[PDB]
Each structure stands twice: as structure tokens, then as C-alpha cells.
Design a protein around this ligand. Structure first.
Ligand SMILES: O[C@@H]1[C@@H](O)[C@H](O[C@@H]2CO[C@@H](O[C@@H]3CO[C@@H](O)[C@H](O)[C@H]3O)[C@H](O)[C@H]2O)OC[C@H]1O
Ligand SMILES: O[C@@H]1[C@@H](O)[C@H](O[C@@H]2CO[C@@H](O)[C@H](O)[C@H]2O)OC[C@H]1O
Length: 228
């Protein structure tokens, strides 16, 4: 079978919570966060892990659901991790950049990381995503471009500077399983070490460096887990 079974059956189930300001919480046993720097935005999170996103006139908007840790353990200490996801794109406009896939942070060192399988922007992210282009790698059965960046901006520690790690899929995928730890393994070979893990979540991010992005996105499947 070319695809995962959840690609055929995914739909929103369970109890839900709609948030319309910056907010971290849990719904059932899944961690969620809405974060934006501006705009009239929302997100609806379901106890089955799935979620949906709206953004209006935003500079940078993130909606994410999955695992929240306490920044005490490296990924290797936590265990091997994966995320199952299904994205359904909807209408959007003035989306200058966007990432869809898995996202999180470490501390010690402070790093934001992305495994990007799709994007709400008209075109995929380009070489501007990072100052260091490590090149093309076969990771988790597919071709990804790996980048490292240094960014000054908001963070889980407040406004500061931090490295970012990216794997950008060369061919968009709208449904499947990301082997998160396989990306971590590749990054380590390239000098991109993971600190103590803060989170690992399915993410939709959309933004624009000058204007204000608007649109919606649906994630009828999103499940992040420790195991196989
Ligand atoms: O981690 C996120 C960053 O990746 C994001 O960085 C901005 C991404 O957009 C960059 O500008 C692009 C230049 O190329 C044009 O064709 C695109 O339309 C532009 O978006 C900008 O330089 C980066 O800073 O910032 C938000 C972070 O969460
Ligand atoms: O109140 C602060 C939040 O605004 C901050 O949120 C993080 C900011 O950087 C973004 O890239 C992250 O996604 C977001 O979680 O977290 C720290 C908190 O004190």
C-alpha cells in the first residue's frame, strides 16, 4: 500500500477547545499551543490530536499539537518518536513563508527544529531558510534538504538568539508518518546536536515578513508518540 491507513479514514473526534489568543494547554492528553505575533487568529484542538487553524492579518502564526516535555531529557533518553499527520489545505493569501510537519525546541542548547513535509505558501521554502545548507540527504525513505540557521527572535526563553535545524522535504507530502528521531540521527552526523527536549508537535506555521498573512488549514489527523 502506497499510503498509511489513517490517510483514508482521518476525521476530527473527541472533545475540543478553541483558543483565540496566545495559549499553551492540554486537551485530553495532548499538548497544544497557539502562538502569533499579531493578527486575529484562532485554533481548535481536539482530544484525538487533530486540530484546525485560522489566521488573519498575521506576521507569524503557529498552531501546533503533540508532545510537551519538561526540558530534562535528550531525545535519546526519551525514546524514539514519530508523528502521524494528515494536512488538508484550504484557502489562504499573502502567505510569504510556511512550514507544515513536526516542530519543537531543545534547551542546552536552545534550538528550534523543523521537519517540513509541506507548506501553505504557494511555493516551498527556499535556501533562505538557513545560512548553512548541508545539502541533500535520504532520511526516513525520502529526500530532504538539511539546513542550519542562526535566528534572532522570539523563543521559548524570551526574545534571544538560537540555532535552528531544518529538514525540508523535496517533494510535498500531505499524509504520512514522520520518523522524527531519524531526522535527529541525521542532524547529529552533521554536527547538529539535540539538547534537552521541550516538545515535539505537528505544526502549521504561516507568515509574512511585511504584510499580514491570512487563511485557514485543517489537520484531520495528528498524533505524536514515543515508540515504533
Ligand atoms: O522559523 C521561522 C523562520 O523561518 C521565519 O523566517 C523568515 C522566513 O521568511 C524569510 O523571507 C523570505 C525570503 O524569500 C521570499 O520569497 C519569501 O516570501 C520570504 O518569506 C525571512 O527572511 C525569514 O526571517 O520567521 C518565523 C520563524 O518562526
Ligand atoms: O510568553 C512567552 C511566549 O510568547 C513564548 O512563545 C514562544 C515564542 O517563540 C515562538 O517561536 C514559539 O513557538 C513560542 O512557543 O514562549 C515563552 C513565553 O514566556
Amino acid at each position: 500500500a502506497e499510503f498509511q491507513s489513517f490517510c483514508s479514514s482521518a476525521s476530527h473526534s473527541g472533545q475540543s477547545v478553541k483558543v483565540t489568543g496566545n495559549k499553551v494547554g492540554t486537551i485530553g492528553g495532548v499538548g497544544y499551543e497557539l502562538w502569533a505575533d499579531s493578527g486575529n487568529n484562532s485554533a481548535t484542538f481536539y482530544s484525538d490530536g487533530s486540530f484546525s487553524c485560522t489566521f488573519q492579518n498575521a506576521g507569524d502564526y503557529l498552531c501546533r499539537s503533540g508532545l510537551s516535555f519538561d526540558s530534562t531529557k535528550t531525545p535519546s533518553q526519551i525514546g524514539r518518536m514519530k508523528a502521524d499527520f494528515k494536512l488538508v489545505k484550504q484557502n489562504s493569501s499573502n502567505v510569504g513563508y510556511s512550514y507544515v510537519g513536526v516542530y519543537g525546541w531543545t534547551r542546552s542548547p536552545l534550538v528550534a527544529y523543523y521537519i517540513v513535509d509541506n507548506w501553505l505558501s504557494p511555493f516551498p521554502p527556499g535556501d533562505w531558510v538557513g545560512n548553512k545548507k548541508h545539502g541533500s540527504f535520504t532520511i526516513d525513505g525520502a529526500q530532504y534538504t538539511v539546513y542550519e540557521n542562526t535566528r534572532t527572535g522570539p523563543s521559548i526563553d524570551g526574545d534571544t538568539t538560537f540555532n535552528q535545524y531544518f529538514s525540508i522535504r523535496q517533494q510535498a507530502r500531505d499524509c504520512g508518518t514522520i520518523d522524527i528521531s531519524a531526522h535527529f540521527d541525521q542532524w547529529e552526523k552533521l554536527g547538529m546536536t539535540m539538547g534537552k527536549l521541550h516538545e515535539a508537535k505537528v505544526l502549521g506555521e504561516a507568515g509574512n515578513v511585511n504584510g499580514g498573512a491570512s487563511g485557514t488549514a485543517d489537520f484531520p489527523y495528528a498524533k505524536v508518540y514515543i515508540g515504533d
